[PDB]
Write a structure and sequence with these properties.
Main location: membrane
Subcellular location: Cell membrane
Radius of gyration: 50 Å
Membrane topology: Multi-pass membrane protein
Bound molecules: cholesterol
Shape: elongated
Distance between the termini: 71 Å
Keywords: Calcium, Calcium channel, Calcium transport, Cell membrane, Ion channel, Ion transport, Membrane, Metal-binding, Nucleotide-binding, Transmembrane, Transmembrane helix, Transport
InterPro entries: Ion_trans_dom (IPR005821), NUDIX_hydrolase-like_dom_sf (IPR015797), NUDIX_hydrolase_dom (IPR000086), TRPM (IPR050927), TRPM-like (IPR057366), TRPM_SLOG (IPR041491), Volt_channel_dom_sf (IPR027359)
Length: about 1350
């Protein structure tokens, strides 16, 4: 059962954390209306969760008012997601608004499949919030059906499908309202007839917001609130809002128009229907450069709109047509998806294209491109930005993009961003770290804080193994194993502590050395510093990638850095130990754990592989690389690391074994056999000079090298132990004297020296636990203990005979252990050593044989002893009789003569004529016994040995190869002098320790390899690493499975190509099948405050017609009546019309182009307009009596696609002119203005063009603009159909066209609306333009002159 929530985490307005507050306290801010009349309203009692049939999960619902804040509703959705999925839920990087048809519609299956596939891919990759209407009809129901499969096929996080619906139309509203909130799991009955509503809610939507205004059955109350919520969500999550238009009626066109106007991009699904097909045609008409769109015309679009929506009136059709053409004006904000052009799997690419055309900046576009997993798009965008001189923005956003690529596990994107000159060690954290009192932590660079941010961000996720690893580690902040609190928690995932955790994971004495001092600016001049900074940075990132088990990024950082082999071994050890750990146990963590083991093996393979390649190329150089001491792991070589990582595969390799055997012999040629080194040992001056060598300067150096060799110390220890065995053996065989003899004193000194060496090893080397673990140290302790017990037994009373006998008895055991201990030196041999390991394995079979024989031995022995002597008291002799002869009869010594004597049988035949008949059963029992022991048990032991031997021979060989290094390491650190004389070595070490600790008169000296040989080793290792990876990749591509898989995919691609072929075929099938005028101005005068003219019909406008019923209204605007400089005087007397007239000595164009001319009224002296009646006398808004000369500047260029081809419509080339949107009435118009005093059309045209299209106004661009402005042609001088025109003042225009044939000069113009223009843009010229006044006639004249489309 589901427990109702009592408290909710509401995110703060600062966006930093969530505060917990009661549900009843939070919900008070939402209101509901009981009736339409109500405005203030009452609190909402309708909120909770709804349970829908055949749906497992419940959907939350909140009924809120129209006046309610959309931020509060956004907080509600965030609170629900925060409760269900935890605080660290996947934030949306995309808001998908689905609008369209309210009524039900059927789409084609392929188109539906393409939309469904693309929308599911986009939604699951970006964690997008899909906002629809929420009702169970049409596009909302369709979107629900698309997201239903996403909710079924995917686990954990499901992207919300928010439905915002009006409450006044919803079935079942009263049931939802009445009750005590919250209603947990309330049943919704969509088929129940709740009067008078017939609209049900979609059952596949994950949340519901019911917006109420008190009305009933009045749809569309929530359209604005929905737009406000989408905009609010987009600002809050810094995510683009993408509207998707499928189908769609007349209101969808206005919705899409609203969406474009607010800057929100739209994706129109072509082939769906109605508004979408109309919008798709219209865009294709205004932008697409393909050959099949060249036949597109407005007439056919108008025909399409008329046949599809069927308007009642022509004005409605005109308004729909104007709005439809207005939507696709800006090509960036509209993206049309079509099946026959883009493709079935290209809808998410179209969504990404809309996103890239929406927000213009490199960082947002690259982050979204990462989210959709389109590297090619990101690569092309980066290349285009690189070519166009946008390198600064690239460098400014590359870090944040690289950080984002690391967080979301995208290695290919990591490789891309790193390739475009982004330094790996220049990473910066997103937040700012607070200052810390610790000097080690304050020394840390920026990229360390960036790695700390990656650890923190990954760690805050639910059920993360990193948090368990850090908590179970039981360490402080700097990683030391010591177990205030606030720092220890805010910076718990620092890099030093993580380095310490990984160090414990490798072994007990692994300590990685960091040097962050090299990242200061003072070291930049040092040669090769950029490599070192790179390498260290790479290493730290590498370790982070090993911890999160991301193999691909780990492999990438491993290949970027250096010291490949050692890093692979360390990685293998950390992953193998990490997979079997307390932090990774759990039912849900199983598969990753598995992954870890897999990854471990892979790294191990790498470590072996590279090494192998090295041994193929140069054996000596490979030997040199394995001997190199590396500073980062406390100055020791790769074999030491490999032993610490327990890499049995690496140690058993022939190259590694060759270096271990080269370390043996102390690097000399002729020292190879036992006899050669033994002969050279005894005879130093007679075999060493005449031998291959790798003055007192040289002979002394070779002597110090030969006797410093570990093999020589082994030979010295063997010879020493052999003399000890021989001398102790003679001592125990020869009789003891009546006093302590000289040989006894020599043996006493020898065993004290041995005892002191064992104590020195215990206190000063490994540890007591480590010493006792070894079996040979235990044997050493037993032999010293036995000798001292025997020696003190003799020395207590030397003349006592009994003491001599007991002392030799103890010393018998001493000689047995001494000769048994001599076997320890057999382990160095390649023949005797593995066999010794095999003997220790076969001891369990020996124990099995002993347990089985013991049964038969005691059973037969008690029975036989009782049978031989049935009338004897039990004594110690009875017990010996039970074990003596039974045990020795299994080795073939049968005491049948002795048994015959004991049985008292006097016959010649062996057990006849006996005193008792029972004793005649003595040979029968024996007969059974030796059948059991010799024929059965011994032969089974032979069978067990053969089986055991075959099983553990290879493992014994591998274990011997690890022990070869162990023995080499052991005899490297050992004291130089042999056992009897080691006391001198002990006193020498004590003297050095006293002189070093107290005296401080000496130090340690060593040799450091040059940088030349170091970079030589580094180059070799890097080259062979690349060579092994190439060989490994080629070998994996030549496998049979890979070839079968690749041929299979090729056959799949072949069908795909046939599918394309069939589409082209069906297209021909279709192709072959089809192969067989008076102007009357509006009544209300503009900008006059509602003053209206005298209305006249269009058949009464001409001046030739009489029209006696004419009573115009005299109105003059306040602006004209205030008398500015460009306005003529209110009294028109003394002014001459029909000729160029001089005002203040400057000529103005007062002559009209009308053939009749301007007529002067006799009564008032005012001029009369020759272009017809306008129902208004006076000057109105026009400043000049008669002809107001205006100049219009049509700056044109050919509309070209990026490829360079000119766009073509109706068989004519299409022009494009700069058009401005007027400030006063928000209608688009041609830029222009009245001709000033003393100037011509050239100056007026240029000044108006600079003022309107350019606003404020260089260098070359000014020269291009001057070159474009130097060739203008007066195309027309006509009368304007301007609504401010009256009978005594009318506008007459001169049109000047500035055409850019090449298009170079026009492309440098930065269009930006200024003065009395709101926006300016390039707009294609056509006959369906809704422009101000008679500017269509002027463009018609421009296109007529240039033979362009109209
Ligand atoms: C761990 C192993 C190798 C050591 C075995 C212990 C040996 C050294 C000890 C343990 C018990 C000892 C025996 C105990 C009793 C006696 C009886 C005495 O009248 C003569 C010596 C003799 C026979 C001892 C000889 C030494 C002895 C066998
Ligand atoms: C126990 C199973 C395996 C087989 C049984 C065989 C036993 C019961 C048989 C085999 C050999 C037999 C013995 C052979 C001969 C003699 C001599 C006779 O004057 C008295 C009985 C005596 C001493 C027999 C006693 C029973 C005996 C021990
Ligand atoms: C193939 C193998 C198992 C052959 C079997 C041999 C058996 C049947 C033989 C071997 C030795 C024999 C024993 C040898 C000696 C004596 C003592 C005699 O006073 C009675 C019979 C008795 C006790 C025999 C019984 C049978 C005997 C146990």
């Amino acid at each position: 059962q589901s427990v109702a929530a009592k408290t909710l985490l509401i995110e703060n307005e600062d966006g930093k954390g969530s505060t917990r507050m009661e549900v009843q306290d939070f919900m008070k801010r939402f209101h509901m209306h009981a009736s339409e009349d109500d405005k203030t309203g009452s609190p909402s009692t309708a909120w909770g969760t709804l349970r829908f049939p055949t749906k497992e999960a419940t959907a939350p619902y909140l009924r809120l008012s129209v006046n309610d804040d959309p931020e509060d509703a956004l907080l509600f959705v965030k609170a629900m997601l925060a409760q269900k999925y935890g605080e660290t839920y996947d934030r949306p990087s995309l808001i998908l608004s689905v609008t369209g048809g309210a009524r039900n519609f059927t789409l084609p299956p392929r188109l539906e499949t393409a939309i469904a596939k693309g929308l599911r891919l986009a939604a699951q990759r970006t964690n997008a919030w899909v906002v629809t209407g929420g009702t169970n009809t049409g596009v909302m129901k369709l979107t629900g059906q698309i997201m239903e499969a996403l909710s079924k096929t995917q686990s954990h996080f499901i992207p919300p499908t928010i439905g915002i619906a009006t409450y006044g139309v919803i079935i079942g509203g009263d049931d939802m309202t009445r009750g005590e909130p919250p209603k947990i799991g309330l049943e919704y009955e969509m088929h129940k007839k709740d009067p008078p509503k017939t609209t049900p809610l979609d059952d596949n939507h994950n949340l519901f917001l019911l917006v109420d205004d008190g009305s009933t059955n009045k749809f569309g109350k929530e359209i604005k609130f929905r737009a406000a919520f989408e905009n609010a969500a987009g600002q809050a999550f810094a995510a683009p809002v993408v509207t998707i238009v499928v189908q769609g009626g007349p209101g969808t066109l206005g919705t899409a128009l609203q969406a474009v106007r607010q800057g929100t991009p739209i994706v129109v699904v072509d082939g769906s229907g109605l508004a979408a097909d109309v919008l798709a045609y219209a865009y294709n008409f205004m932008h697409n450069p393909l050959t099949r769109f060249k036949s597109y015309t407005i007439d056919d679009l108008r025909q399409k709109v008329a046949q599809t929506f069927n308007p009642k009136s022509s004005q409605q059709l005109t308004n729909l047509l104007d709005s439809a053409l207005e939507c696709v004006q800006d090509p960036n904000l509209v993206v049309v998806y079509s099946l026959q052009e883009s493709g079935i799997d290209e809808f998410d690419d179209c969504i990404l294209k809309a996103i890239f055309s929406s927000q213009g900046k490199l960082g947002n576009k690259l982050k979204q491109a990462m989210y959709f997993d389109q590297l090619d798009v990101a690569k092309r965008a980066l290349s285009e930005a690189s070519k166009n001189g946008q390198h600064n923005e690239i460098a400014a956003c590359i870090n944040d993009n690289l950080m984002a690529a690391m967080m979301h596990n995208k290695p290919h994107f990591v490789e891309l961003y790193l390739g475009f000159d982004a330094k790996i060690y220049e990473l910066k954290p997103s937040e700012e770290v607070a200052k810390t009192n610790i000097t080690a932590l304050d020394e840390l660079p920026s990229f360390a804080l960036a790695i700390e941010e990656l650890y923190k961000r990954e760690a805050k996720k639910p059920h993360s193994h990193v948090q368990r690893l850090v908590s179970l580690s039981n360490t402080d902040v700097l990683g030391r194993h010591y177990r205030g609190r606030d720092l220890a928690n805010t910076r718990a995932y620092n890099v030093l502590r993580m380095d310490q955790i990984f160090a414990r994971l490798v072994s007990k004495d692994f300590s990685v050395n960091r040097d962050f001092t090299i990242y200061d600016s003072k070291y930049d001049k040092v040669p090769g510093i950029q490599f070192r900074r790179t390498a260290q940075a790479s290493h730290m990132l590498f370790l982070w990638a090993i911890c999160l088990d991301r193999f691909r990024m780990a492999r990438h950082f491993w290949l970027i850095g250096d010291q490949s082999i050692i890093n692979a071994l360390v990685a293998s050890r950390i992953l193998e130990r990490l997979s079997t750990h307390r932090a990774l146990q759990g039912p849900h963590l199983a598969e990753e754990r598995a992954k870890m083991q897999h990854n471990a093996k892979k790294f191990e393979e790498l470590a072996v592989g590279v090494l192998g390649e090295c041994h193929g190329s140069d054996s000596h150089m490979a030997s040199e690389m394995l001997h190199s001491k590396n500073d980062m792991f406390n100055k020791k070589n790769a074999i030491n690391i490999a032993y610490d990582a327990k890499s049995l595969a690496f140690l058993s390799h022939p190259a590694t074994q060759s270096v271990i055997n080269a370390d043996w012999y102390g690097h000399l040629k002729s020292v190879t056999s036992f006899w050669a080194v033994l002969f050279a040992f005894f005879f130093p001056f007679f075999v060493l000079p005449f031998i291959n060598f790798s003055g007192a300067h040289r002979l002394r150096r070779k002597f110090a090298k030969f006797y410093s060799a570990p093999y020589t110390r082994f030979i010295s220890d063997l010879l020493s132990h052999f003399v000890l065995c021989v001398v102790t053996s003679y001592f125990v065989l020869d009789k003891l004297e009546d006093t302590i003899s000289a040989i006894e004193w020599i043996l006493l000194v020898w065993f004290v020296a041995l005892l002191l060496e064992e104590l020195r090893q215990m206190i000063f080397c490994d540890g007591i636990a480590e010493y006792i673990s070894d079996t040979w140290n235990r044997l050493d302790l037993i032999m010293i203990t036995l000798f001292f017990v025997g020696f003190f037994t003799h020395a207590s009373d030397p003349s006592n005979q009994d003491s001599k006998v007991v002392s030799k008895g103890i010393h018998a055991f001493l000689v047995v252990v001494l000769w048994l201990r001599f076997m320890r030196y057999y382990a160095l041999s390649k023949n005797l050593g593995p066999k010794l390991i095999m003997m220790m394995e076969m001891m369990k079979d020996v124990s099995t044989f002993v347990f089985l024989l013991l049964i038969f031995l005691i059973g037969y022995g008690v029975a036989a002893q009782s049978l031989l002597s049935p009338d004897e008291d039990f004594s110690s002799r009875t017990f010996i009789g039970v074990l003596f002869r039974p045990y020795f009869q299994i080795y073939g010594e049968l005491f049948l003569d002795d048994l015959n004597s004991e049985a008292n049988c006097l016959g010649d035949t062996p057990f006849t004529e006996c005193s008792r008949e029972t004793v005649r059963m003595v040979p029968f029992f024996l007969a059974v016994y030796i059948l059991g022991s010799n024929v059965l048990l011994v032969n089974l032991l032979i069978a067990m040995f053969n089986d055991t031997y075959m099983k553990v021979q290879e493992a014994a060989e591998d274990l011997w190869r690890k022990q070869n290094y162990e023995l080499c390491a052991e005899y490297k650190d050992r004291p130089f002098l042999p056992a009897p004389f080691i006391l001198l070595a002990h006193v020498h070490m004590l003297f050095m320790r006293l002189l070093r600790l107290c005296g401080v008169h000496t130090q340690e000296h060593e040799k450091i390899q040059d940088d030349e040989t170091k970079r030589k080793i580094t180059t070799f290792e890097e080259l062979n690493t690349d060579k092994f990876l190439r060989r490994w990749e080629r070998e994996r591509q030549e496998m049979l499975e890979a070839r079968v898989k690749m041929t299979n995919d090729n056959v799949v691609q072949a069908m795909g190509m046939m599918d394309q072929l069939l589409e082209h075929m069906i297209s021909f099938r279709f192709s072959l099948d089809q192969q067989a005028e008076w102007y009357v101005p509006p009544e209300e005068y503009p900008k006059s405050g509602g003053v209206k003219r005298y209305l006249i019909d269009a058949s009464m406008v001409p001046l030739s017609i009489m029209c006696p019923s004419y009573d115009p209204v005299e109105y003059t605007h306040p602006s004209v009546a205030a008398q500015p400089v460009w306005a003529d005087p209110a009294d028109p007397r003394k002014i001459k019309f029909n000729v160029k007239d001089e005002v203040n000595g400057k000529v103005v164009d007062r002559t009209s182009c009308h053939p009749s001319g301007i007529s002067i009224d006799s009564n008032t002296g005012r001029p009369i307009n020759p272009w017809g009646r306008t129902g208004m006398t006076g000057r109105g808004l026009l400043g000049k009596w008669g002809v107001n000369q205006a100049a219009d500047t049509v700056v044109t260029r050919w509309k070209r696609s990026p490829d360079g081809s000119i766009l073509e419509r109706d068989g004519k080339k299409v022009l494009e002119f700069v058009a401005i949107q007027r400030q006063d009435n928000k209608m688009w118009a041609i830029p222009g203005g009245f001709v000033d005093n003393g100037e011509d059309v050239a100056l007026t045209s240029g000044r108006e063009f600079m003022e309107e299209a350019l606003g404020m106004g260089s260098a070359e661009s000014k020269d291009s603009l001057a070159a474009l402005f130097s060739s203008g042609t007066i195309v027309a001088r006509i009368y304007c159909e301007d609504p401010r025109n009256t009978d005594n003042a009318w506008v007459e225009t001169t049109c000047v066209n500035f055409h850019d044939e090449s298009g170079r000069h026009a492309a440098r113009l930065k269009l930006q609306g200024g003065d009395d223009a709101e926006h300016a843009r390039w707009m294609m010229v056509h006959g369906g333009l809704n422009l101000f006044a008679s500017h269509r006639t002027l463009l018609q004249h421009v296109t007529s002159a240039l033979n362009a489309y109209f």
